[PDB]
Amino acid sequence: GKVVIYSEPEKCIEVFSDIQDCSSWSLSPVILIKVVRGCWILYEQPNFEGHSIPLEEGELELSGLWGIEDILERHEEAESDKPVVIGSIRHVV
C-alpha cells in the first residue's frame, strides 16, 4: 500500500512501509492523510502502541488531540495549536 501525508495542506511525506517511530516528525495542527491504496493504522505511540486510528483507502483531515476531551467532543474534532503527533504507522499487509 501507500499513504501520503500533507503536513501543510504541496509537499508530503510518502509512506510505503511500516514506521515504528514517527514521533520525531514535526507536522501541523491540521494535516491531510491520504491513503492511496492498502490499509494502514496510525498509532499514538512508537512501536504500534497507544490509541489507534485504522485507515482504508481515502482522505482524512486529521487534527486535534488523542483520546477524549469531553467539553469539546460534539460537533467536530477540536483543533489544537500543537502539531499533530503520530507515534508510529503500521502498514497492513
The fraction of residues in strands falls at 35-45%
Task: Quote the distance from N terminus to C terminus.
Answer: 8 Å
Largest beta sheet: what is the strand line-up? Answer: 2-1-3-6
Helix content: under 10%
Could you name the CATH class?
Mainly Beta
User: Which radius of gyration do the C-alpha atoms yield?
Assistant: 13 Å
The helix/strand class is mainly beta
Function: May function as suppressor of malignant melanoma. It may exert its effects through interactions with the cytoskeleton.
Organism: Homo sapiens (Human)
Family: Belongs to the beta/gamma-crystallin family.
Protein name: Beta/gamma crystallin domain-containing protein 1
Tell me what you see in this structure.
It comes from Homo sapiens (Human). This is Beta/gamma crystallin domain-containing protein 1. Belongs to the beta/gamma-crystallin family. May function as suppressor of malignant melanoma. It may exert its effects through interactions with the cytoskeleton. The PDB classes it as oncoprotein. This protein has no helices and 7 strands. It has about 90 residues and is mostly beta strands. The strands form 2 sheets. A 4-stranded antiparallel beta sheet has the order 2-1-3-6, with no helix packed on it. A 3-stranded antiparallel beta sheet has the order 5-4-7, with no helix packed on it. A hairpin with a 3-residue loop joins strand 4 (about 40-45) and strand 5. The protein has strands at about 1-5, 15, 30-35, 40-45, 50-55, 60-65, 90. The protein has a single domain, classed as Gamma-B Crystallin, domain 1 (Sandwich), CATH 2.60.20.10.
